[PDB]
């Protein structure tokens with residue numbers, strides 16, 4: 001019931017007590033581990049509220065206070081009357097920060113307490129949503145000196161008045177299927193791109209077309225908006241040794257901003273809660289550029305390097321992979337856009353774990369997602385045992401809106 | 408019940424039914440995933456159902472389920488159990504069992520080869536000297552002058568837990584580690600404790616960076632005895648790089664034969680506590696883990712210096728760059744010397760095909776993603792994108808405690 005995790009590089013052992021507070025389920029059982037699977041009423045509401053308010057009031061050293069009891073009573077009375085309840089600003093900010101703190105798949109959580117929370121609960125329309133999002137984008141970008149932020153739209157009511165950002169991320173490149181049979185731009189975004197066109201977007205059929213926002217307010221029909229180009233900071237990718245690299249025509253955007261997840265706080269559900277931090281280099285250079293079902297540039301790069309691509313054992317793929325990731329980091333750094341390499345980031349995370357174990361009694365972590373997609377065992381997280389469990393508040397996946405939407 | 412796994416690169420979906428035959432536990436619960444945790448004398452009572460489960464599987468596999476031969480065998484085993492408190496496997500059952508333990512090993516990427524395993528029956532062995540002879544023969548057969556052949560040698564099963572056969576070496580061939588008074592380490596830091604035991608047991612250490620350890624062999628629960636594997640049987644490979652000529656001067660080599668000797672083979676409830684097995688190396692085992700772990704030979708710095716990489720900031724990815732060159736060198740050396748080796752691209756691609764074949768023919772393939780994905784370049788291998796289900800089937804290979812912690816010394 002008290003669990004130990006070992007680091008096999010350092011022999012440091014940590015003891016986890018925090019998992020006992022866990023409430024949501026894992027997908028795993030005593031007979032089967034699903035650790036590598038990517039996607040495994042009033043009566044319901046009050047214990048969730050209580051659960052949350054207890055941890056909130058504990059966090060401010062006011063557990064068992066009159067203010068605690070009063071709030072507990074006030075929320076209880078409000079649920080009986082209104083079926084739901086509204087969070088105080090203080091609770092909202094606490095909840096969002098802790099959702100991030102509890103994100104077991106996030107290597108960047110050392111930063112969790114430094115998060116700018118934009119309260120957009122007064123938003124009523126898609127145009128309003130657009131305004132709020134432009135402001136988020138500009139604030140977070142900060143001329144390349146990135147700052148973590150979340151913008152939080154009104155909470156779910158009856159599920160028929162959901163606010164949704166249809167984009168999976170605030171900033172992404174379009175995807176187009178060619179009559180050539182091939183794929184132009186980002187293959188991951190082909191279907192979403194069609195929904196944009198079908199809803200009226202005039203696509204420029206390029207390779208790096210920043211997508212438009214598709215915004216849904218109050219359960220109404222979604223609408224299209226274009227982020228001001230001057231608010232989308234992009235970085236042309238060059239290599240600090242290969243002059244030819246620039247001719248590949250690669251660029252990426254500076255702001256990673258996830259917009260499709262569900263924020264759950266104290267039983268309440270925030271269906272539209274876009275959040276952003278800054279990139280770890282491998283996200284772009286390993287996954288975005290080298291994934292086979294993505295931009296898949298390994299072959300082109302290798303040829304420019306004149307590698308023997310006859311036999312896998314020459315490790316030409318591995319060599320190109322490194323150089324591509326070198327270029328990414330170099331290009332962001334040169335243009336003063338915040339970025340972190342996988343060594344720095346995993347090193348920070350180990351320090352964060354040790355802090356969390358020391359100050360909270362644990363840190364839920366998903367090894368499968370925490371270990372970088374390149375050079376795994378030369379990062380300290382590879383050698384770190386991690387316990388994965390679900391704490392609340394949380395960010396959760398939710399179904400894409402086009403499957404759910406009564407049009 | 409049915410379970411789906413998805414490959415996120417291809418959208419290929421597979422359906423697992425095999426997990427219904429799972430017995431042993433995972434360590435996980437509905438509240439916690441222990442998927443990245445490294446680690447987790449039997450009564451007649453529990454033994455016969457374990458025997459029966461096994462014998463049912465065996466007779467199904469040879470398409471004689473329910474046959475008179477099947478029924479007589481169950482009969483014969485049941486009686487032998489209630490009479491002698493244990494039982495003996497037939498040669499055929501032993502071979503079937505060993506192959507399936509490998510086939511079931513969810514942490515092994517090399518399982519496409521599982522049906523080609525040479526099984527050496529060493530159940531007639533009685534002394535440590537006899538163990539030595541068997542192990543030399545295994546090493547010679549498996550090495551095959553560089554054309555490596557998978558093999559396993561199976562020593563007598565556990566009886567009361569007081570007469571265990573054990574190979575004290577974690578692997579048959581491995582380099583010594585020596586801790587210096589200044590705190591530095593000569594050789595393989597992983598093997599310091601065991602090296603110290605060997606020395607205490609009377610081994611004369613040459614004290615170099617690549618000293619092959621002697622074998623420490625325990626028969627019938629007696630105190631272990633030291634033996635030196637004939638050097639001419641230990642195939643080694645000097646590591647050089649195809650373009651960097653200074654790489655040879657790093658003075659690196661490795662042995663060709665990876666042979667795990669510290670695990671326990673369970674077949675039909677019987678426990679084989681000494682069952683050394685061998686295959687051939689995937690390059691990253693040596694080039695990534697052995698050479699480049701901070702806790703092992705740790706050569707990243709020296710290599711990076713000789714390549715003259717910018718090492719002042721990690722963002723140059725000097726470590727990643729050096730790591731690739733080292734791994735090219737390992738593969739290059741082995742291939743040049745005609746010693747069997749496989750790269751992590753070939754091996755993972757072969758595993759995916761094996762896994763899919765297993766799903767179609769067997770209804771599943773238990774696999775541990777955390778171990779299957781190679782320790783470099785993870786997502787440019789197809790296993791990274793493959794959802795996997797991890798569960799435990801028997802027969803199986805299991806960890807067991809280190810013998811120096813449990814052994815009762817006779818003196």
Ligand code: HEM
Pocket residue numbers: 096100103105106107108109111115148149150275276277278279280283340345369395
């Ligand atoms: C500030 C620097 C940050 C870094 C370096 C970072 C890094 C990462 C990385 C590399 C991943 C894996 C994503 C993937 O492979 O697709 C991830 C996942 C995740 N991050 Fe962080 N992140 C940062 C900020 C944030 C913030 C501000 C939040 C929320 C407020 C957050 C919440 C999450 C969540 C919920 C996941 C898992 C999402 C999923 O399961 O798909 N991150 N992060």
Ligand code: HEM
Pocket residue numbers: 505509512514515516517518520524557558559684685686687688689692749754778804
């Ligand atoms: C023939 C070529 C083979 C290849 C390329 C191969 C590859 C591998 C690799 C890379 C690992 C991970 C090792 C580590 O990271 O320490 C592994 C683990 C394992 N292999 Fe295979 N292997 C082969 C043959 C065999 C054979 C012949 C057996 C048994 C009959 C076997 C059983 C296992 C088991 C039980 C593990 C898990 C070890 C543990 O948990 O410590 N393998 N294999």
Ligand SMILES: Cc1cc(N)nc(CCc2cc(F)cc(CCCN(C)C)c2)c1
Pocket residue numbers: 108169171172256257258275276277278279280283
């Ligand atoms: C907040 C944040 C910071 C950071 N460094 N990275 C992220 C993820 C950004 C991202 C950006 C993006 F465009 C796509 C994805 C993942 C796509 C869906 N997966 C599940 C296949 C993620 C988010």
Ligand SMILES: Cc1cc(N)nc(CCc2cc(F)cc(CCCN(C)C)c2)c1
Pocket residue numbers: 517578580581665666667684685686687688689692
């Ligand atoms: C049979 C076989 C084939 C193959 N390609 N590889 C192996 C593993 C070889 C090996 C050889 C070795 F010396 C050490 C290890 C791992 C030690 C335990 N870890 C947790 C530190 C493994 C075994």
Ligand SMILES: C[C@H](O)[C@H](O)[C@H]1CNc2nc(N)[nH]c(=O)c2N1
Pocket residue numbers: 036037038368369370415791792793794795
């Ligand atoms: C199947 C497997 O779970 C899938 O490929 C995962 C593996 N680990 C990952 N880790 C991160 N950080 N991001 C990912 O998209 C994935 N994909």
Ligand SMILES: C[C@H](O)[C@H](O)[C@H]1CNc2nc(N)[nH]c(=O)c2N1
Pocket residue numbers: 008382383384385386443444445777778779
């Ligand atoms: C903590 C973690 O489970 C540990 O470092 C594992 C990770 N995956 C591995 N995978 C392989 N093949 N071999 C290993 O030793 C490990 N070590």
Ligand SMILES: [Zn+2]
Pocket residue numbers: 028029032033034035435439440441442
């Ligand atoms: Zn699990």
